Design brief:
The structure is cut from a larger assembly and holds two copies of chain A (35 residues). Chain A is mostly helical. Chain A is 83% helix and 0% strand. The longest helix of chain A is centred in the middle third of the chain and has 23 residues, at 2-24. Chains A, B: It comes from Mus musculus.
């Protein structure tokens, strides 16, 4: 029970990280660096 | 036999070069140069 919920929470954190990385993958930050 | 294999190897080298050039054709290196 608790083990399954903790594992699901870990996978949820991974999924959120994946979404954030996909959003940041635009690769426009380089331009900012240039500025 | 050996002639055909050598010719095939030459064409394979050409094909690999073509793939690498297609990959590098992104033309983003200019930005790096600017940096």
């Amino acid at each position: 029970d608790n083990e399954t919920l903790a594992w699901e929470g870990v996978m949820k954190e991974n999924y959120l990280v994946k979404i954030n990385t996909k959003a940041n993958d635009n690769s426009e930050e380089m331009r900012h660096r240039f500025r």
